[PDB]
Design an enzyme around this catalytic site. Sequence first.
Site, PDB file in Angstrom:
ATOM      1  N   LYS A   7       0.829  -1.190   0.000  1.00  0.00           N
ATOM      2  CA  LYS A   7       0.000   0.000   0.000  1.00  0.00           C
ATOM      3  C   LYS A   7       0.884   1.268   0.000  1.00  0.00           C
ATOM      4  O   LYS A   7       0.599   2.216  -0.726  1.00  0.00           O
ATOM      5  CB  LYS A   7      -0.950  -0.021   1.195  1.00  0.00           C
ATOM      6  CG  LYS A   7      -2.032   1.042   1.161  1.00  0.00           C
ATOM      7  CD  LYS A   7      -3.094   0.777   2.208  1.00  0.00           C
ATOM      8  CE  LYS A   7      -4.114   1.899   2.224  1.00  0.00           C
ATOM      9  NZ  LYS A   7      -5.244   1.582   3.136  1.00  0.00           N
ATOM     10  N   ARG A  10       2.208   1.824  -3.551  1.00  0.00           N
ATOM     11  CA  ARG A  10       1.094   2.258  -4.435  1.00  0.00           C
ATOM     12  C   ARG A  10       0.645   3.709  -4.205  1.00  0.00           C
ATOM     13  O   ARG A  10       0.461   4.485  -5.154  1.00  0.00           O
ATOM     14  CB  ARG A  10      -0.124   1.349  -4.244  1.00  0.00           C
ATOM     15  CG  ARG A  10      -1.353   1.759  -5.054  1.00  0.00           C
ATOM     16  CD  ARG A  10      -2.479   0.743  -4.909  1.00  0.00           C
ATOM     17  NE  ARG A  10      -3.082   0.745  -3.579  1.00  0.00           N
ATOM     18  CZ  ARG A  10      -4.060   1.552  -3.182  1.00  0.00           C
ATOM     19  NH1 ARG A  10      -4.581   2.450  -4.007  1.00  0.00           N
ATOM     20  NH2 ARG A  10      -4.531   1.453  -1.946  1.00  0.00           N
ATOM     21  N   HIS A  12       2.387   6.074  -2.430  1.00  0.00           N
ATOM     22  CA  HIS A  12       3.408   7.115  -2.252  1.00  0.00           C
ATOM     23  C   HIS A  12       4.690   7.060  -3.077  1.00  0.00           C
ATOM     24  O   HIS A  12       5.415   8.052  -3.134  1.00  0.00           O
ATOM     25  CB  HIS A  12       3.710   7.285  -0.759  1.00  0.00           C
ATOM     26  CG  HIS A  12       2.535   7.771   0.032  1.00  0.00           C
ATOM     27  ND1 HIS A  12       2.043   9.053  -0.080  1.00  0.00           N
ATOM     28  CD2 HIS A  12       1.746   7.145   0.936  1.00  0.00           C
ATOM     29  CE1 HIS A  12       1.010   9.201   0.731  1.00  0.00           C
ATOM     30  NE2 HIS A  12       0.814   8.057   1.365  1.00  0.00           N
ATOM     31  N   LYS A  34      -9.317  11.410  -2.575  1.00  0.00           N
ATOM     32  CA  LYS A  34      -8.368  11.469  -1.459  1.00  0.00           C
ATOM     33  C   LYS A  34      -7.766  12.868  -1.460  1.00  0.00           C
ATOM     34  O   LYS A  34      -7.011  13.207  -2.371  1.00  0.00           O
ATOM     35  CB  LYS A  34      -7.266  10.412  -1.605  1.00  0.00           C
ATOM     36  CG  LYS A  34      -6.437  10.198  -0.338  1.00  0.00           C
ATOM     37  CD  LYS A  34      -5.692   8.862  -0.341  1.00  0.00           C
ATOM     38  CE  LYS A  34      -5.864   8.081   0.966  1.00  0.00           C
ATOM     39  NZ  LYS A  34      -5.138   8.688   2.122  1.00  0.00           N
ATOM     40  N   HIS A 112       3.829   3.999   6.064  1.00  0.00           N
ATOM     41  CA  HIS A 112       3.003   5.179   6.119  1.00  0.00           C
ATOM     42  C   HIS A 112       3.834   6.421   5.871  1.00  0.00           C
ATOM     43  O   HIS A 112       4.937   6.528   6.337  1.00  0.00           O
ATOM     44  CB  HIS A 112       2.320   5.263   7.472  1.00  0.00           C
ATOM     45  CG  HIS A 112       1.186   6.238   7.512  1.00  0.00           C
ATOM     46  ND1 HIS A 112      -0.083   5.936   7.049  1.00  0.00           N
ATOM     47  CD2 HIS A 112       1.125   7.508   7.983  1.00  0.00           C
ATOM     48  CE1 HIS A 112      -0.872   6.975   7.238  1.00  0.00           C
ATOM     49  NE2 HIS A 112      -0.164   7.942   7.795  1.00  0.00           N
ATOM     50  N   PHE A 113       3.297   7.363   5.117  1.00  0.00           N
ATOM     51  CA  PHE A 113       4.007   8.592   4.834  1.00  0.00           C
ATOM     52  C   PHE A 113       3.455   9.564   5.862  1.00  0.00           C
ATOM     53  O   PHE A 113       2.261   9.739   5.936  1.00  0.00           O
ATOM     54  CB  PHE A 113       3.719   9.071   3.416  1.00  0.00           C
ATOM     55  CG  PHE A 113       4.445  10.320   3.044  1.00  0.00           C
ATOM     56  CD1 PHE A 113       5.712  10.257   2.506  1.00  0.00           C
ATOM     57  CD2 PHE A 113       3.873  11.555   3.265  1.00  0.00           C
ATOM     58  CE1 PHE A 113       6.391  11.411   2.147  1.00  0.00           C
ATOM     59  CE2 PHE A 113       4.556  12.711   2.917  1.00  0.00           C
ATOM     60  CZ  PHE A 113       5.816  12.631   2.382  1.00  0.00           C
ATOM     61  N   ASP A 114       4.328  10.147   6.683  1.00  0.00           N
ATOM     62  CA  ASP A 114       3.883  10.934   7.833  1.00  0.00           C
ATOM     63  C   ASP A 114       3.889  12.421   7.523  1.00  0.00           C
ATOM     64  O   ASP A 114       2.953  13.137   7.905  1.00  0.00           O
ATOM     65  CB  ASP A 114       4.765  10.673   9.074  1.00  0.00           C
ATOM     66  CG  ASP A 114       3.990  10.826  10.367  1.00  0.00           C
ATOM     67  OD1 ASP A 114       2.846  10.285  10.406  1.00  0.00           O
ATOM     68  OD2 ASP A 114       4.491  11.493  11.337  1.00  0.00           O
TER      69      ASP A 114
END
Length: 117
Positions: A7, A10, A12, A34, A112-114
């Site tokens: 995920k 996909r 980021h 989004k 996760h992109f923070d």
Amino acid sequence: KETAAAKFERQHMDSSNYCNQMMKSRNLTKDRCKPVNTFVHESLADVQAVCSQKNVACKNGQTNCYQSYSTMSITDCRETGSSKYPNCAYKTTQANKHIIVACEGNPYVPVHFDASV
């Protein structure tokens, strides 16, 4: 189902138009528009290496976030005012900033992109 790491790639990875193509192709205009998304225009190995770089607090208070030593080229896509689902319209934007990602797993990879700084 896809792994969280899958995920992350996909949503980021990617090694005011460009976004419209991308928010679509990556399935981020699928059930909703989004609102904001960052794509990182660097190599997979580069972005994965960030998991061993500067350890910093995540926005949710977890401690598994990491900040890149070098700046990284990234595209922020933000959703314009007239943009409505399902004609999600996006303002492409370009930066060179440090990225922050949360990493997890064995192997330890981005999930996760923070933020970008």
